[model samples]
Target: FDPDSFKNKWLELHNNERTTRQLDSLEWDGDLAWKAQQVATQCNVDNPQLWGDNGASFNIGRYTKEQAFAEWTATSGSFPDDRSIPWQRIVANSAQKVGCGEATCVLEGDMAYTVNVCYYDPPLSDYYTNAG
Candidate 1:
């Protein structure tokens, strides 16, 4: 996939969520992006170091960037009462910067998957207080 388009779409989707809530849009951070790239390259959801609070989602088949966003935003069982961390992190008003990375990997049994990871700075400490 085109890296520029991937980043653009990722930002667009994130900003769109923030826009709906009247929250300030997030700016791209190279440092966070670099961290995200490292995590994506590993194709694992866990990160070794803590730069900030983060969210990750993956798809086990061919998927579009939009599909990846959909997976992250999909409503959880507690919807309207409690939102998923991924959604909360995306809309958190205090998170002023965001960086995302995407990677396609072939795993065991020749299964292909896409891993998407994003980092948010000034991590959302208290969901109830910070998500607004």
Candidate 2:
């Protein structure tokens, strides 16, 4: 055979075999969101924002500083089925604040304990509010 032809044949064979491989086994993997979707669908809580709707803010005017502190500590952060009383949080140590006067800051605090009491009407007649 011609030397060039023989070399070309080997080169072609080498190039084809070098690039190709026969399959031995094949497997498929997936990080499916089926479980997450199922949970949301089953619970009918598709909205992420609405998931935390049970938590609401309250004023500490009705309770003493110590009592308010206890209530704050007892507040639940988690939202659950059925429903729960909305939690209260005392935003302290900041000059930044909301409105004032009756229905807002209905009462003053004890100057000794340094606890400020304020109330907020939840903007609706019923005061029914949500996380959203």
Best by TM-score: 1
lDDT score for candidate 2 against the true structure:
0.26
Clash pairs of candidate 1? none
Q: Give one digit per residue, the lDDT tens place, for model 1 in 34-131.
A: 77777777765544334343433212112566776676677434543445665667776678888877677777888888777677776766756675
Q: After superposition, how far is residue 35 of candidate 2 from its true place, in Å?
A: 49
Output the TM-score of candidate 1: 0.75
lDDT of 2 at 22: 32
State the displacement of the C-alpha of residue 28, model 2, in Å, after optimal TM-score superposition.
58
Q: Compute each candidate's TM-score over C-alphas.
A: 0.75, 0.22
Off by over 4 Å in 1: 46-63, 76-83, 109-111
